[PDB]
Amino acid sequence: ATSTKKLHKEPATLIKAIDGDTVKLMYKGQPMTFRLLLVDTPETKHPKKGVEKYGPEASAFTKKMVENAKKIEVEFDKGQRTDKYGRGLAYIYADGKMVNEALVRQGLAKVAYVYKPNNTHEQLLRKSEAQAKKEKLNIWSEDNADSGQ
Numbered sequence: 001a002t003s004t005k006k007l008h009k010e011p012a013t014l015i016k017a018i019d020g021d022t023v024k025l026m027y028k029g030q031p032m033t034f035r036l037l038l039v040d041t042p043e044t045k046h047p048k049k050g051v052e053k054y055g056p057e058a059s060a061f062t063k064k065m066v067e068n069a070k071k072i073e074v075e076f077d078k079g080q081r082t083d084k085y086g087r088g089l090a091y092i093y094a095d096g097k098m099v100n101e102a103l104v105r106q107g108l109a110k111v112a113y114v115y116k117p118n119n120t121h122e123q124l125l126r127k128s129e130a131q132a133k134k135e136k137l138n139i140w141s142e143d144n145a146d147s148g149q
């Protein structure tokens, strides 16, 4: 009967996307850098981690993604609101699509960074990760023949 949604979704502005899991948007007159939660692209080499060996074009993915997104929204979780760097953490959406599950759906970003209570969508993201693993898309280009837990 009444409209019912999940968490609090707020509108934002597309200022300039940097990487696939990082984009600068505007919020209530506040340009900040948001980073996809529960995801870690191999191209992003901020830490000593570096790119394993699949450095794809994630930045381009979110590039045309939010660029064509008729509406860019952000959903802060119930955990903290920013990281130790002040970055804003929130699941971004576009046209009703979860950008986080988008990259993980194309087998580009690997699920990771799990620190409760910031993982409300841990089962939904892990699900898209299982589909990208069976489809073997990009990073999932291994030779799953014998298989084994």
Ligand SMILES: Cc1cn([C@H]2C[C@H](OP(=O)(O)O)[C@@H](COP(=O)(O)O)O2)c(=O)[nH]c1=O
Pocket: 035, 037, 038, 046, 047, 083, 084, 087, 113, 114, 115, 118
């Ligand atoms: C997303 C996330 C990041 N972090 C820390 C680990 C990483 O530390 P370092 O900065 O030392 O690498 C950094 C990764 O964030 P980004 O994915 O935005 O780069 O933030 C957490 O502790 N919890 C989280 O939920």
